[PDB]
């Protein structure tokens, strides 16, 4: 029989690393049906905040307005998604945006020629003033209660160095961007992960002994820290499977064609998660788990 | 279309979660059926995927001007050695996983970068 | 024309690395693979986005209808 208790006995997690952007960990004794659910929720269903509505007031630059709005929608914003609610689309445009669900960013930048530039200068930063527009130039314009709620943490891009646009003297950009909550299954700009995926733990079943110089070349067919030579007997053994990238270079030699079988542990998933910047990868994974549970609970409580 | 006369219309915008994903974590942006090749016989597209993967890995550009290789120095061998010396395999295949069921696919999948 | 904000395949923000890539190519005498690795681009999907960018915006900008030439 299968039971939640029998799953709780055998399931375990091995966090290999954890940063503010990337978290590498393991899920053991779980089914692909649930690991894939977690991965799909991380990529598509976990909400984040991105620029959606752009209100241009002037754009005399070479980049056209739709392209510039698309770029401004792509830049990730360091906003905690819980700090704002969801936009009610059915409401009219006047009352649709409010201080609890919309974040206003502005970008006003004019390019003027630098009258102190040296002769023979080819650097645009020395020839012109504001010849480059960066995501850091996206000022945050708090309105209403967010002037107090966001005082602890001002909204800035996760990558202020993103080169939004370039300018030349006389040219200018003046725009407002409205940032709301959305999910990545709608538009890829709301996806909060650079990439979240997994891979089964590789298995390297050595069938016959590889004693001798053959161990030197057999170990040469894998990533450096995967096969080792035993201190006692000159034998090859599997040190670390996680270090193996499955490239089957050993299979390309008929010497080992009947000495090793390459397989996988069909329940040992190595989740690698990277964050765009708005949330930590561990919190992304936690939110995906919670989303699956909450959607199941909504189905349970829905009348049939 | 590729630079090998492999024209085709876009039939669906496949969502990225439903796209197959590799052991590296990347999901291809173009899917071309393997059945486009056996009758068209555009092996240049295969070797271009191979060379493009090797070049994007080693940070180099490979030339493809005709009649630089021959039957003793095969581009398959050349770009396969370049791929093996980077951690990927000789034949350009990658272990991919189904994005709908999450299981690993039945065989290694031929991937690469083509223009 | 101008560097893309994100990588097409995975979605990693690569729009803040073009100027650094040029700096590491020019000031430091780094080859393209080394510069891409030192920028943090490991997947070839992310490497291609910077390795193959053309940067036509600079050539577009020379035709300025708002300044005397």
């Amino acid at each position: 029989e299968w039971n939640v208790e029998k799953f709780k006995k055998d399931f375990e997690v091995n966090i290999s690393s954890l940063d503010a952007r990337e978290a590498n960990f393991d899920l053991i004794n779980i089914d692909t049906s649930i690991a894939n659910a977690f991965r799909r929720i991380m990529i598509s269903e976990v909400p984040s905040v991105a620029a959606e509505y752009v209100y241009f007031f002037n754009n005399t630059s070479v980049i056209q307005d739709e392209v510039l709005a698309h770029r401004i929608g792509l830049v990730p914003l360091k906003v905690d998604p819980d700090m704002l609610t969801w936009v009610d689309s059915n409401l009219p445009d006047d009352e649709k945006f409010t201080d609890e669900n919309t974040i206003v960013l502005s970008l006003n930048v004019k390019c003027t020629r630098n009258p102190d530039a040296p002769k023979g200068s080819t650097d645009p930063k020395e020839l012109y003033n504001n010849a480059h527009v960066y995501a850091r130039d996206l000022k945050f314009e708090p309105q209403g209660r967010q002037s107090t709620t966001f005082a602890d943490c001002p909204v800035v891009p996760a990558d202020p160095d993103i080169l939004l646009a370039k300018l030349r003297p006389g040219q200018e950009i003046s725009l407002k961007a409205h940032c709301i909550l959305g999910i990545g299954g709608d538009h890829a700009k709301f996806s909060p992960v650079s990439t979240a995926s997994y891979r089964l733990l590789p298995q390297i079943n050595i069938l016959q002994p590889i004693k001798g110089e053959s161990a030197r070349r057999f170990q040469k067919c894998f990533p450096p820290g995967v096969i080792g030579i035993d201190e006692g007997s000159d034998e090859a053994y599997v040190k670390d499977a996680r270090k193996d990238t499955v490239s089957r270079e050993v299979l390309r030699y008929e010497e080992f064609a009947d000495k090793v079988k390459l397989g996988r542990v069909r329940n040992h998933f190595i989740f690698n998660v990277e964050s765009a910047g708005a949330m930590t990868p561990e919190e992304i994974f936690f939110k995906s788990v919670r989303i699956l549970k909450n959607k199941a609970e909504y189905l349970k409580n829905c009348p049939i | 279309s590729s630079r090998h006369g492999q024209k085709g219309v876009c039939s669906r915008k496949w969502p990225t979660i439903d796209m197959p994903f590799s052991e590296t974590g990347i999901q291809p942006d173009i899917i071309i059926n393997p059945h486009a090749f056996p009758s068209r016989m555009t092996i240049g597209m295969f070797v271009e995927s191979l060379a493009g993967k090797a070049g994007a890995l080693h940070g180099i550009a490979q030339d493809s001007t005709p009649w630089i290789f021959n039957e003793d120095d095969t581009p398959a061998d050349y770009f396969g050695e370049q791929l093996a010396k980077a951690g990927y395999n000789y034949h350009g295949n990658e272990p991919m996983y189904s994005g709908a069921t999450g299981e690993e696919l039945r065989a290694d999948i031929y991937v690469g970068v083509v223009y | 024309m101008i560097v893309p904000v994100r990588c097409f395949s995975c979605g990693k923000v690569v729009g803040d690395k073009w100027e650094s890539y040029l700096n590491l190519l020019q000031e430091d005498e780094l080859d393209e693979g080394t510069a891409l690795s030192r920028l943090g681009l490991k997947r070839y999907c992310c490497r291609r986005m910077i390795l193959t960018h053309v940067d036509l915006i600079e050539k577009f900008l020379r035709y300025n209808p708002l300044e005397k030439r």
Binding site: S197, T245 | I68, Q82, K85, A86, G87, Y88 | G33
Partner: peptide, 19 residues
């Protein structure tokens, strides 16, 4: 005929995720 010039300084670029 001289064979196609083998590029030099080819090192490992692919590593398993998290390493």
């Amino acid at each position: 005929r001289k064979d196609v010039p083998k590029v030099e300084g080819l090192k490992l670029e692919h590593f398993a995720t998290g390493y």
